[PDB]
Every structure is written in C-alpha cells, then in structure tokens.
C-alpha cells in the first residue's frame, strides 16, 4: 500500500510506482527510476544481502 495504510484506508499500488513517488518526493524525477529500474533493483538486492 505504501503510506496509505497509516493515514486511512489501504490503497493498492505497484511497488515501482511507490518508489517513483518516493523519488519524486525528494526532488528526483521519476524517469531515472522508470528507466534504470534493473540497476536500482540489483543495488537494493545487494544491500539486503
């Protein structure tokens, strides 16, 4: 759900679009995530590992 579960009813939303929202919230455009999605995913997986 993202952040909607803590401010009211839960709203379904894809995780990449939630990441795009979180990147746009700090000033970074959504294109760098919708284009370089595999790199961000691999970096996140490497960090989790």
């Amino acid at each position: 759900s993202g952040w909607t579960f803590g401010a009211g009813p839960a709203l379904q939303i894809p995780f990449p679009m939630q990441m795009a929202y979180r990147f746009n919230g700090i000033g970074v455009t959504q294109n760098v995530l919708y284009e370089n999605q595999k790199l961000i995913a691999n970096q996140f997986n490497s960090a989790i590992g």
Binding site: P16, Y34, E35, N36, Q37
Partner: peptide, 19 residues
C-alpha cells in the same frame, strides 16, 4: 527501456488551433 508501458496517444494544445 521502460518496462510495462502501453501504446496510447496524447493530445496537443497547439495542433488544432494551428490547423
């Protein structure tokens, strides 16, 4: 490079006024 994009058309606020 975008994964999950579909084909669609966008509108132009200049073409109908110019043509």
């Amino acid at each position: 490079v975008v994964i999950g994009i579909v084909n669609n058309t966008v509108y132009d606020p200049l073409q109908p006024e110019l043509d």
